Amino acid sequence: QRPTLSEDVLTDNRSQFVIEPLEPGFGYTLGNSLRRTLLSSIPGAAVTSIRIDGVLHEFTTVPGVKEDVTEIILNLKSLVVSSEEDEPVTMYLRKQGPGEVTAGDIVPPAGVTVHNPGMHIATLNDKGKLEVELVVERGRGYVPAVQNRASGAEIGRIPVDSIYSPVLKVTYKVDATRTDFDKLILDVETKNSISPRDALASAGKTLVELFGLAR
Amino acid sequence: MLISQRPTLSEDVLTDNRSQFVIEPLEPGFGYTLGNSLRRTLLSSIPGAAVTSIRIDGVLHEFTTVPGVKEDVTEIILNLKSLVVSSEEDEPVTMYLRKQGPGEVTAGDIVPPAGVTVHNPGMHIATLNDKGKLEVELVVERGRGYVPAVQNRASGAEIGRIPVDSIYSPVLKVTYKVDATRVEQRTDFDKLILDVETKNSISPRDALASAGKTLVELFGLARELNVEAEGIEI
Amino acid sequence: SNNSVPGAPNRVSFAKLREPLEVPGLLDVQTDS
Amino acid sequence: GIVRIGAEVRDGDILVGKVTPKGETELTPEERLLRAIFGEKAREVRDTSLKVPHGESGKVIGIRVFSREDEDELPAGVNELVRVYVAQKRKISDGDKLAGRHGNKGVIGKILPVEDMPFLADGTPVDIILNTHGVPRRMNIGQILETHLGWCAHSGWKVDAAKGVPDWAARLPDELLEAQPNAIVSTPVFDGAQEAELQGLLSCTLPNRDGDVLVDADGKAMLFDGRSGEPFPYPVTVGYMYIMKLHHLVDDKIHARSTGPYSMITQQPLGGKAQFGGQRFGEMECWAMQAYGAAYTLQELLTIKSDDTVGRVKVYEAIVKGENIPEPGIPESFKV
Amino acid sequence: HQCGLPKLMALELFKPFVMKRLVDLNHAQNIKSAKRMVERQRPQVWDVLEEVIAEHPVLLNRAPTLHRLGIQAFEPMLVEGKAIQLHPLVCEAFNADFDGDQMAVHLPLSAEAQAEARILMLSSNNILSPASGRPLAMPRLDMVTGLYYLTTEVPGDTGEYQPASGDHPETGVYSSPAEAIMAADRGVLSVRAKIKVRLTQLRPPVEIEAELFGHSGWQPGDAWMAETTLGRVMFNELLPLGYPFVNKQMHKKVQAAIINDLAERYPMIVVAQTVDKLKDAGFYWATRSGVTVSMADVLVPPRKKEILDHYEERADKVEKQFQRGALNHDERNEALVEIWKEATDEVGQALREHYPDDNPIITIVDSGATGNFTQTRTLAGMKGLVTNPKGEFIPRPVKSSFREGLTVLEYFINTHGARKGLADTALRTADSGYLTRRLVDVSQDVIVREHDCQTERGIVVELAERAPDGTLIRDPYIETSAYARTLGTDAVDEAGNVIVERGQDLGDPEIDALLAAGITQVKVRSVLTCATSTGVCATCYGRSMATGKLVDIGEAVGIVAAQSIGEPGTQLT
Amino acid sequence: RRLSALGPGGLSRERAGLEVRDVHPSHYGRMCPIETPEGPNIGLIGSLSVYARVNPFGFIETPYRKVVDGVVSDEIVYLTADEEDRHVVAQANSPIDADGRFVEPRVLVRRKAGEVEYVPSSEVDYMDVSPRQMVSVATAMIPFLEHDDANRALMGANMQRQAVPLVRSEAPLVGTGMELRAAIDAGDVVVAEESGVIEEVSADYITVMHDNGTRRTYRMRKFARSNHGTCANQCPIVDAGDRVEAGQVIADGPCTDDGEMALGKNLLVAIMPWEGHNY
Amino acid sequence: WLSAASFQETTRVLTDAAINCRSDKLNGLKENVIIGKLIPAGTGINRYRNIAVQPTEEARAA
Amino acid sequence: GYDTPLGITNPPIDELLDRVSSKYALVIYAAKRARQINDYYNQLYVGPLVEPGLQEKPLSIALREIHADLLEHTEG
RNA sequence: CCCUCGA
Ligand SMILES: [Zn+2]
């Protein structure tokens, strides 16, 4: 009998996947091959760099804004963003105080999406104003901020650490019993960027092409 | 997302039944993602044929010694578990072994039924004096991996039937190591070494190819969830 | 639980003993002199 | 000639350009010929510009300038004084020093991909792996106790008061009979959480989001091997410990030199990383060389690698031309 | 033989070699373009670096250098990051604590310097302690634990061999270690469970090889049946081919014995690769050993309160004797010190009785990996008597263990001895270095100048001693006195035949022949009686403890002697 | 808070024997026995204990509780080292019930010239005002200090002062309760001198409008270089409209989180050998 | 006197050595370290350092 | 009986020491030979007696030559 | 050098 894979969804960002049956002892290493590929190689989108009007570097303040630029960048690392463009695109943020600036206030171009509109970005009083450009690219894994000398970028640009991976938390367990067989339960939790089903699918493509090296 | 440098597979043949394979270079961390799954796949996922139970005429209740045979019962069991056999039948098949008089009983003396092959006929099984005779029945099946003896115990088991540990796996031993290879500025790239030793039923090459096939299907189960899903292509 | 400082985060203490005396200003060795 | 605010500067980049007057005799014969035939009348100068030291990078976050042209008060003979402030973000890295509050220290020997870190049943990878062999013989067991209490604080707890107050909790304050996740607690010195109290709280540990208890009453958990996926065979002690980043960091430490500045006095290389100096090969280091009986290495270290003034230059000349190393000369320190 | 070298370090140190190399290739137009090209770290250099570093050794040094193994030669490996990567086995020689220790790198230039690094100073060419001849680069800490756990036999473990009974066949026997591994991948067999395996690839012990094999002895492929654990089979696979199977739980001392035997009878390269394999297996299995620390694993003596109460009664009696006028103050303190020493010993005994042998605190000490039971007793049982600033015991002990946590007064009391011990170590490590310097200066010019001075003089060493019973007692000093010498007179053994000829190394086999022949005394050659005018002759000095062979002409044995005497000096209280 | 023995009028480093560097029974509650360098300066530099004062004549005093007729009162008296030798002082770990009576008839005390004795509770003069009374500020921040040997406890006190300020701070889940009062007194945190309401807040400054109608503004240190090259950066923890009180923390400093000293992060830790990399 | 001056009591050794017009022979290894000469030990011995290396005739043929 | 030697380990030190009276003489032996080789390469006197590796260092060539007994040396 | 700190 050949094994099969059935999905049982828990939340919109979390699903379980059962693979059975499998030769005894085979479940752990399979679920872990999948976990290893999920936590690393799943494609995604993240902010590459930002440009704030009036600041030429990240250690400084914006008049009327409560969080300094370093704290703002820390807050922007929590952005979850999905981009179909497959090339650098630019999002804009313009807000006049007072009030709360949240990720909803970002204006994405067509083809890219902000998935957490309530994420706190900054707090502004009557004198605060925030004008920010945010560059978005597609990638995988984690690439630290690309230095401006590695680019042709000018001084106003502030590169950012890019965490692309859409997946959040992954685990597995096996139920070990036909005659003797192993049942794999793979637990996948992503961000709202993509669905667990799709993350597991791209993991499947990566592993299928990779294990093709052993014919 | 990106396209890595295409890793290559290479084989250094140590002996007829033993070989090393290297996959390299691998993006850092992928050596361990392929490694244990490839080892456990090579061990447990390849079908083969093995002896399951044996009947030895003349031993019933106490299994210690066979009159007229130098080897005791459990040593005959050891010599039989090492017997290398292939079977097309997919259903259990009984083969018979009988020899009389003084001499040496080897696997070559087995009369194979149609559809089975003993690959190591010269293997020493027992040795007999003039007064003794060896009449022994073997039940050979197909399976995967290594099943212990207690799992071969029949609920209606016959008297005198001795269940044995069955080695179905045509590959005897597999170990793996992940070294570091250098790609341009990165010295932490992954290189996968697989040391694999099989029986004479299969070569290491075809074993690796079989494990790769069944793995490609297995993770194809995940790929098929969405065929539009984008992943590493190299 | 350090209740003598307003707005201090609530940190629950395992202390069995009661401290009758508050900690003096830790710079008093400088400023007092 | 001063670097602009916000620029990204790597070692060797010019922070502040500066020129110093150079005498006629200090020109090379080739440099003298070109300046003459090309009719260059400009002042002969040397480039004294302030550059970033080796192994440094950052952004320019500030500039101060003081001029004698203005009324800025400067020391005698100083026309202009420029300060440049560079800021670097330092990610934790192999060779940095971490420590707990109990005296437990170490360098980071490896940082691993999050995937092959050992992980709990719910998928959580651990942050840090401390070796078992280093705890007991140091006689700091608080680091273990803290780790036990750190987990209870992380997951929260509710003791079971239904039948009544258990004997082990009988002396606890009523506000410690339960705690929400991520509760902050204080265990004062010499009036602390007792052994039995810490042990009881380990039983009432709250579950995770799935209702699963990840840590048993012994403070241990089953872990999975991130590399092989196989579970580790025995429960490992896990918890939350407070770890500090100490000010000994590889970036300030790693140093290497081929050749460089020499002391005018002893004609030996300078010392310290700031001066781009060499390492001291001392008395005891020479005993080792003699004990090995390696004569050429010891002679090479004490002549053409340090003192011998013609040899150090002839050696570099030979390496570039790919020739054999010349025979050493007389060390300057002997003439001294 | 390798060490991790950061990329930037190696680029700076090798700068001229890189410059010339990429000048030869099209990469650089002239040597100055090579210089500027290296200072900017252009991408072309890295490949070139990999080429120029190959088989070019480097010297690594950690201060203080107490002996010559404080400097060793390694082949450099380009490594990511800014830190130097040290091989785990040399940490004994350098005393590298990895708490922030730093080391220095030196690059040999001339052909002679490189040759000296490859031959004289190479890491894998000095495995042995030059002082005692014992193995130095040897498993310790995690590695030991990993091997210990691996080779422990557990009665009643999973898959254990069972004998046949009526209607029940014989289970737990395997046709090959491969099959036992296959059973171990399932949950069927434990690595620590006793089984019977058919081994064709390992040599049996000496008795089994004699009785079970003919004139040829054991040969590769010859099958024999062994009763042992799978773990011990895997352990013996790390040893060289043809080494007799050792079926033993591996304590640190057993591993040391095996490695010393290997160094004696096998080429040094085989020793190097062997101890590498022992390192890998020891780490892998230490990860899976299950040693950890918990408050639950720290067990307390059950009777402790009753014990300390009894000895408290004794103390009260002593105090009443003091106020009675029947005792001095010094005599009272002496009595109380005896009482609390006894109580501490008893609490330590009960503590040891209460612990199982698989407890992590116990197994980590008892394997030889790290620590001692006095630490265990201080943690679990009690701290005991603490020393004054003057060094005298305080008549009031610390009854609290560190597991219980100490009262404020007990902690204050303990600080005296803690700090005074810290400063004491500070001075000790100084005076030790001073003595080392004087020994070096007095012995510096002592060198082996000639092969043999042929002096008949020598020293009498006591090889053993005869008890009232016929049994002879092995002399405790044999290792440092009789071993490694060279014979000055043939050993007659109170009989016609001569057991060992003059001039032999007096190794383990010759010592065994001498002892079995019943000889209690030997006359050996020494440097004390050496007749060489300048320095000493190789024969009077005898074996070089590091190489195990006769000392070479030109070895500086005075500096080696001074380092050997001075290096332990920090450990002398 | 350092107490240094080296300098003009003091002793030379050459002339300082091992008897000057030892813990002394008069140090109790005055100079911390734990915190001191482990290098050549060991015993030559020390820390003032948490409750200690310097009296007008230069002598260090520590508070104690009057013990009258075997009862432990709340009357506090600051005693010098001389005055302390005439009396009998019970340690803080000595148990007391709701009443001032001692739980045990015999109690371990220091009485004359720093001897430790089981002693009658009937005669007791004073008692420690708390544990940690003998300990410095940095040492009082070690949780489960009583379970650590004095050497590692020394290493812990010195190592806390070597911690670099992180881009973001995090308070420890497990404190000793000293972290808040240490951060405020150190002064790298911003505190409201007068109670009021926050009129305006930004990263640059905070202004508080007092009930007087008078207001007070606090400017923030922003990415300032410390002497050793670490980053002194203050951030406001209050919002516009919030009501604050005198002594409340307005803004965090480099190593503070919500006003408590945060010298590090809470990391998930597993205790186990792993493949030789934690060797 | 060179070896002894670098050990202890340098003033004393140098006064005494000057009054006695002592002539250091330089044969020591510490003296060889000071003047930059190969120490008379190990690879610095006349026996090893003066070795003459020549390829054999059979090897030069190939 | 040893596995494949790597880098500095090749050629094995036991056999090199089997070629020479003492380790020090092996050092000067191989060193002077390496200088002869390098001088031969630069001077455009006798070249390598084995087949050299790609970029292989002259000292390694010398050690391989000694291992194969391709040269003789006088101690003096 | 001295202060202070790391092994
Ligand atoms: Zn002699």
UniProtKB/Swiss-Prot annotation, chain B:
It comes from the Bacteria. The chain holds residues 1 to 234 of 347 of the full protein. The N-terminal domain is essential for RNAP assembly and basal transcription, whereas the C-terminal domain is involved in interaction with transcriptional regulators and with upstream promoter elements. GO terms for biological process: DNA-templated transcription. Belongs to the RNA polymerase alpha chain family. It is an enzyme of class 2 (transferase). This is DNA-directed RNA polymerase subunit alpha. Induction: 3-fold repressed by starvation. Homodimer. The RNAP catalytic core consists of 2 alpha, 1 beta, 1 beta' and 1 omega subunit. When a sigma factor is associated with the core the holoenzyme is formed, which can initiate transcription. GO terms for cellular component: cytoplasm; cytosol; DNA-directed RNA polymerase complex; peptidoglycan-based cell wall; plasma membrane. Its EC number is 2.7.7.6. GO terms for molecular function: DNA binding; DNA-directed RNA polymerase activity; protein dimerization activity.
From Swiss-Prot, chain E:
GO terms for molecular function: DNA binding; DNA-directed RNA polymerase activity; magnesium ion binding; zinc ion binding. Belongs to the RNA polymerase beta' chain family. DNA-dependent RNA polymerase catalyzes the transcription of DNA into RNA using the four ribonucleoside triphosphates as substrates. One of its GO terms (biological process) is DNA-templated transcription. The gene is rpoC. The RNAP catalytic core consists of 2 alpha, 1 beta, 1 beta' and 1 omega subunit. When a sigma factor is associated with the core the holoenzyme is formed, which can initiate transcription. Mg(2+) binds at residues 97, 99, 101. The keyword Magnesium applies. It comes from Mycobacterium tuberculosis (strain ATCC 25618 / H37Rv). This is DNA-directed RNA polymerase subunit beta'. Induction: 6-fold repressed by starvation. GO terms for cellular component: cytosol; DNA-directed RNA polymerase complex; peptidoglycan-based cell wall; plasma membrane. Zn(2+) 2 binds at residues 453, 530, 537, 540. It comes from the Bacteria. The keyword Transmembrane does not apply. Keywords: DNA-directed RNA polymerase, Magnesium, Metal-binding, Nucleotidyltransferase, Transcription, Transferase, Zinc.
UniProtKB/Swiss-Prot annotation, chain F:
GO terms for biological process: DNA-templated transcription; response to antibiotic. One of its GO terms (molecular function) is DNA-directed RNA polymerase activity. It comes from the Bacteria. GO terms for cellular component: cytosol; DNA-directed RNA polymerase complex; peptidoglycan-based cell wall; plasma membrane. Disulfide bonds: none annotated. The keyword Transferase applies. Keywords: Antibiotic resistance, DNA-directed RNA polymerase, Nucleotidyltransferase, Transcription, Transferase. The RNAP catalytic core consists of 2 alpha, 1 beta, 1 beta' and 1 omega subunit. When a sigma factor is associated with the core the holoenzyme is formed, which can initiate transcription. Interacts with CarD, TRCF (Mfd) and RbpA. Belongs to the RNA polymerase beta chain family. DNA-dependent RNA polymerase catalyzes the transcription of DNA into RNA using the four ribonucleoside triphosphates as substrates. This is DNA-directed RNA polymerase subunit beta. The chain holds residues 453 to 731 of 1178 of the full protein.
Curated annotation (Swiss-Prot), chain H:
It comes from the Bacteria. One of its GO terms (cellular component) is cytosol. It catalyses: RNA(n) + a ribonucleoside 5'-triphosphate = RNA(n+1) + diphosphate. It is an enzyme of class 2 (transferase). The keyword Glycosyltransferase does not apply. Keywords: DNA-directed RNA polymerase, Nucleotidyltransferase, Transcription, Transferase. Its EC number is 2.7.7.6. The keyword Cell membrane does not apply. GO terms for biological process: DNA-templated transcription initiation. GO terms for molecular function: bacterial-type RNA polymerase core enzyme binding; DNA binding; DNA-directed RNA polymerase activity. Promotes RNA polymerase assembly. Latches the N- and C-terminal regions of the beta' subunit thereby facilitating its interaction with the beta and alpha subunits. The RNAP catalytic core consists of 2 alpha, 1 beta, 1 beta' and 1 omega subunit. When a sigma factor is associated with the core the holoenzyme is formed, which can initiate transcription. Belongs to the RNA polymerase subunit omega family. This is DNA-directed RNA polymerase subunit omega. It comes from Mycobacterium tuberculosis (strain ATCC 25618 / H37Rv).
